[model samples]
Target: VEGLPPGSALLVVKRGPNAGSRFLLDQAITSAGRHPDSDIFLDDVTVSRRHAEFRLENNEFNVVDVGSLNGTYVNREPVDSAVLANGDEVQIGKFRLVFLTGPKQ
Candidate 1:
């Protein structure tokens, strides 16, 4: 299918300030937070400076919470880290990022 390249993933911002933004998880490690250097930086107060990291491993993506004050969630449930599934929704602060292994329909 003409979806994401093999072993790749995409993060689509469905809620919050940067809603409608698309972030491709093309690198080995992608950071997410309120910090300017974060690969998935969200310019909002609710987000922590060093919030989370999205790591690519074994042809899959994993989301890891980096000791943030708020917390990270997979499908609305808090988690220290979790391997991303095809349509998992990741929530950090007020932003809701939908993880996709394939193209959205």
Candidate 2:
């Protein structure tokens, strides 16, 4: 619900797994996975080395599953890819993250 600078977004873990953590999607591509090199490292066994990715394009964020065994989810439903809205829940492993963005200009 809060506004950010022109090109930034927030990923807050509301519950499950990592409840108090947060991620910032400030790059063109934000990779989330168990790999240490991943931009958003999950560090869980259920997570793959390269589980998912969030791509920032045209001022919007699109989450895509990167050939992970378990798959990615939005709003608790499975998705190969999905564009995130102002308040979307992205689930990776058991962790649930709330994707938040400012209102469009």
Candidate 3:
């Protein structure tokens, strides 16, 4: 028998001007966009107003594109929806988000 640690994973802004910013996968749904209301408000002109969203279920992250003009890319190619893994890079606008585990690192 085995067990996993009771912890969480998150997205860290690894690229672009806002690098080092971390979005802990705390909410059931975390939103990112150009809009100020978004959970992850990307203050970039390249980003759209409600560009992308993340859903956390069973501690797994699922990202969904909200018909953004710039498009959402998981490691490169565009996708309407994609399941995220640790260390996966998500490209939205000119930003690169590194999916990671725990509050640290």
Candidate 4:
């Protein structure tokens, strides 16, 4: 996904084990948000693992790992990796989120 406007949120799904999810999230962040100051958040939905949240700002784009055991999906479709958009449906491990535009404030 390219040319995303400001305040756009991109969500990435995590699949498989911790190692796989970790790697995928890393690569997704690097590839998707190439800038130095993008605001991205990662949320863990996996019950077996500690749930966490992270953020990145002023960069290109960002991805968040929805905590999952079997992995997360978007719009009921399994995504090894994906770029999110406004009002996009994101599945984390077992949790789902609707990416909204603008800041949380």
The residue pairs that clash in candidate 3, if any, are none
lDDT (tens digit, per residue) of candidate 2 on 14-74: 8767788988888889999999999998888988899999999888899999998898999
Task: List model 1 lDDT by residue over 1-105, tens digit each.
Answer: 247766567899998888999888878999999899899888788889999999988777899999999999999999999999977999999999998785332
Worst 10 residues of 4 by lDDT: 19-28
Against the reference, the lDDT scores of all candidates come to 0.88, 0.87, 0.83, 0.40
Error of 3 at 41 (Å): 0.8
Per-model TM against the reference? 0.90, 0.90, 0.86, 0.39
lDDT per residue, candidate 4, 1-105, as tens digits? Answer: 243334334343334233223212222233212122323333333432422222344432334344434554557876544555555665545545554444331
Q: Which stretches of candidate 2 lie above 4 Å from their native place?
A: 1-3, 103-105
**lDDT of model 2 at residue 94?**
76
For residues 1-105, write the lDDT of model 3, one tens digit per residue: 012224556688988978998776667789999998998889898999999999877657789999899899998989999888777899989999987755421
Candidate that beats the other on lDDT, 2 or 3, i.e. the better one:
2
Candidate 3 regions exceeding 4 Å error are 1-7, 103-105
Worst 10 residues of 1 by lDDT: 1-10
- Looking at candidate 2, what is the lDDT of residue 56? 90
- lDDT, residue 10, candidate 4: 38
